[PDB]
Backbone:
């Protein structure tokens, strides 16, 4: 039900990723440049998911609860899986 | 060095650092074979005056095996002998040419598999029941925007080449696949309001089409370059 | 200053290939402007979704413009690509201002927002097409 | 920066009932201004001594920070007395732009 | 090893100017900390507002620290600005955990 808070947090995180990128590109495709973009991909996909939640909130009320139930436990799984895929190739 | 001999055979040696320039075709980047060369010739003496010839053709050039570039690998080198004609006369020439090949394994993981994973992820949308619209609309939007961002940043990270490449072709292909999947569901949404039979029909039809089409595209792509 | 010299002049003619800058910056900007149309066709109640949409378009436009003007030197006058970028930019921010004012007007009366969308959906794409018509015809 | 300051001004008209919206706005303006400053400090030529554009950006940062503190004060003091906040809103709406324009007039008279 | 050689010496003294770094990093830190201490005067019932308020201060601290630490030249030990940035960066976590336990 808190409409402005979630959108503000999403926009803020996206801008922070923008600044972190534009700082990091300056300091082929290096291994360090790959990891920094998947951060952006996740933190943008989350805001897109909440956009979908607010759009399809009216038709299926029980779906949004199920959507949070999936996401809360799947985002950490995906992030740990990406960390596993990334750092094993490093060593 | 200067080394004389009892029969008058002089021997002149130098130690040179040349920043030579070779032309690189990058239409097949990054799955390409480079032919960089080094051309040597006399300058003031015509072919009626001086003669060049490699001494010990088998052992003319040494130490190539120990060469190890950080990104390429020396496949093979060949030797040439020619006579070139300019406006002033006929001058002799010798050539040294060795192929260059890239290490594809360093680029596969870093470039290709993100788009592959996104394309495969776009397939899971079909397995969800067509009643749940949000679960598929979210996947479609997320996959399209993710392909957009990966394409943009991967294009920016690659070195600056002002003409078309092949990795761009593959990225365009994957983008077309995911965008057509999104439009596929966007049309199924419109036709489902009219009638559910046609909607479920086209859904299962695309389900049985797309994997075969994608595998065919990848096979056609990888057989022609490798 | 000294005297009359003699000068030999040679002109090497050159032409820039356009095959790259089409699929590099012009075609992505056209695709992003056309994509920005989806915001209008969405429901007028959903604020967060269309805000995400607009933020996406804005970020892509800015990151495109940075490199587009970086590849080219810094001259006083405006190039024939600055105008195209500025038209992309004006259309996307006009759509953003339209969304911003609809988000305020839809509360008092829904018919106002409905009519605004019904007008914009045909107004914006036709204008962008007419602008492409005016642009690409002259230079060739 | 002028756009960010005007957007920070936009928050005053909003009713005090929906406080979360104006809180989100007063926060987003601050962080957007900080990010704009940090991004602008790269493309400019790297010179390690004070410029005028930096003083200008810091001035705008001070403006938005003062606006957010003002709203925090209004939100805390309202529950005891409503007329205080109902006056402060209408006085701030007209005092922020005046001070901002006066500061800009002084700046552009002295550095042009 | 060869012998005793005469050697003239000259020392030039230098002192870094701080005026730029005052308006560059330190003052944004102080502003961000003062802003993060504002949360206590918000209402305890409006939970999401306070949560966003606390998180965005940490976001600002991260952006500011990344922007500031880039110009520092590489050294083995820790510079004297690093301690200030670390404390300025830990107080916001303190305030956030305080809000959490409240
Ligand atoms: C890189 O490109 C150059 C340019 O083509 C390659 O040089 C070419 O090498 C082939 C054989 O190595 C030459 O063919 C020869 O032609 C003479 C003509 O009489 C013939 O007598 C020989 O038996 C042989 O067939 C070809 O002329 C030569 N091209 C030029 C312009 O000199 C080079 O081989 C390439 N690099 C590698 C690693 O292959
Ligand atoms: C990008 C991948 C990694 C995490 C995945 C998400 C994990 C959880 C959800 C919630 C689920 O409801 C819809 C799919 C979605 C958005 C997934 C979409 C594809 C995502 C964003
Ligand atoms: C990343 C992979 C690993 C687990 C996968 C998820 C497994 C379960 C689901 C629930 C399903 O409904 C939607 C796809 C999704 C999010 C998958 C999206 C792609 C994920 C997140
Ligand atoms: C897109 C951002 C930039 C300006 C923001 C707007 C600034 C002012 C308002 C008025 C406010 O009332 C509702 C949020 C809104 C539309 C914001 C929605 C998100 C917007 C459109
Ligand atoms: C903001 C305040 C604090 C410092 C003040 C500045 C102090 C020094 C000068 C130089 C002076 O010349 C013009 C006024 C100015 C810019 C002041 C403008 C108003 C400023 C920027
Ligand atoms: C300029 C900033 C710094 C001090 C701020 C003032 C602090 C106190 C008040 C009193 C308050 O009543 C109205 C806002 C105002 C004028 C603020 C307007 C914006 C000001 C002038
Ligand atoms: C919107 C109205 C209500 C208050 C008016 C403002 C009252 C005070 C000023 C300061 C004045 O200087 C310029 C006009 C302005 C911005 C007015 C512009 C039109 C405003 C913003
Ligand atoms: C805001 C005022 C109060 C303290 C003032 C600062 C006091 C000390 C300095 C250091 C000086 O160097 C530049 C001006 C500045 C930033 C002043 C700018 C205007 C400030 C930040
Ligand atoms: C924040 C205030 C409180 C202490 C002030 C500082 C006190 C001492 C100095 C050293 C002086 O040299 C420059 C101003 C400065 C940084 C002041 C800047 C503004 C500061 C940091
Ligand atoms: C990690 C810290 C930083 C933000 C904190 C969160 C801020 C907001 C909330 C919501 C609140 O309800 C429960 C505590 C929690 C998860 C906090 C848990 C501890 C967190 C995640």
Residues:
């Amino acid at each position: 039900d808190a409409v402005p808070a979630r959108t503000s947090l999403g926009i803020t995180t996206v801008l922070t990723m923008t600044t972190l990128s534009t700082i990091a590109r300056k300091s082929y495709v290096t291994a360090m440049d790959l990891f920094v973009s998947v951060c952006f991909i996740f933190v943008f996909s989350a805001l897109v998911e909440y956009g979908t939640l607010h759009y399809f909130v009216s038709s299926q009320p029980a779906r949004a609860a199920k959507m949070d139930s999936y996401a809360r436990i799947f985002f950490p799984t995906a992030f740990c899986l990406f960390n596993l895929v990334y750092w094993v190739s490093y060593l | 060095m200067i080394r004389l001999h009892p029969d008058g055979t002089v021997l002149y040696g130098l130690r040179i650092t040349t920043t030579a320039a070779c032309m690189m075709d990058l239409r097949r980047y990054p799955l390409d074979e480079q032919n960089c060369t080094l051309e040597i010739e006399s300058y003031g003496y015509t072919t009626d005056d001086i003669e060049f010839y490699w001494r010990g053709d088998d052992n003319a050039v040494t130490g190539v095996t120990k060469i190890e570039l950080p990104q390429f690998s020396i496949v093979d080198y060949k030797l040439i002998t020619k006579k070139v004609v300019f406006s002033t006369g006929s001058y002799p020439r010798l050539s040294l040419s060795f192929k260059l090949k890239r290490n594809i394994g360093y680029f596969i993981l870093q470039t290709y598999m993100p788009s592959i994973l996104i394309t495969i992820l776009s397939w899971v949308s079909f397995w969800i029941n067509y009643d749940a619209s949000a679960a598929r609309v979210a996947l479609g939007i997320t996959t399209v925007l993710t392909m957009t961002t990966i394409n943009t940043h991967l294009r920016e990270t690659l070195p600056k080449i002002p003409y078309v490449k092949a990795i761009d072709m593959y990225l365009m292909g994957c983008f077309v696949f995911v965008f057509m999947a999104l439009l596929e569901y966007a049309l199924v949404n419109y036709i489902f309001f009219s009638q559910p039979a046609r909607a479920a029909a086209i859904d299962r039809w695309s389900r049985i089409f797309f994997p075969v089409v994608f595998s065919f595209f990848n096979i056609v792509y990888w057989l022609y370059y490798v | 200053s000294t005297g009359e010299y003699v000068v030999m002049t040679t002109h090497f003619h050159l032409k820039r290939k356009i095959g790259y800058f089409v699929i590099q910056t012009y075609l992505p900007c056209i695709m992003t402007v056309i994509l920005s149309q989806v915001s209008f066709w969405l429901n007028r109640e959903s604020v967060p979704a269309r805000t995400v949409f607009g933020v996406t378009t804005v970020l892509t436009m800015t990151t495109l413009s940075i490199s587009a003007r970086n590849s080219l030197p810094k001259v006083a006058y405006a190039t024939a690509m600055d105008w195209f970028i500025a038209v992309c930019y004006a259309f996307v921010f006009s759509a953003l201002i339209e969304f911003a004012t609809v988000n305020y007007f839809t509360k008092s009366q829904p018919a106002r927002a409905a009519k605004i969308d019904r007008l914009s959906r045909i107004a914006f794409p036709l204008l962008f097409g007419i602008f492409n018509l005016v642009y690409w015809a002259t230079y060739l």
The CA atoms of residues 27 and 165 of chain B lie 5 Å apart. Chains B and E do not touch (no CB pair under 8 Å). The first strand of chain B starts at residue 2 and ends at 3.
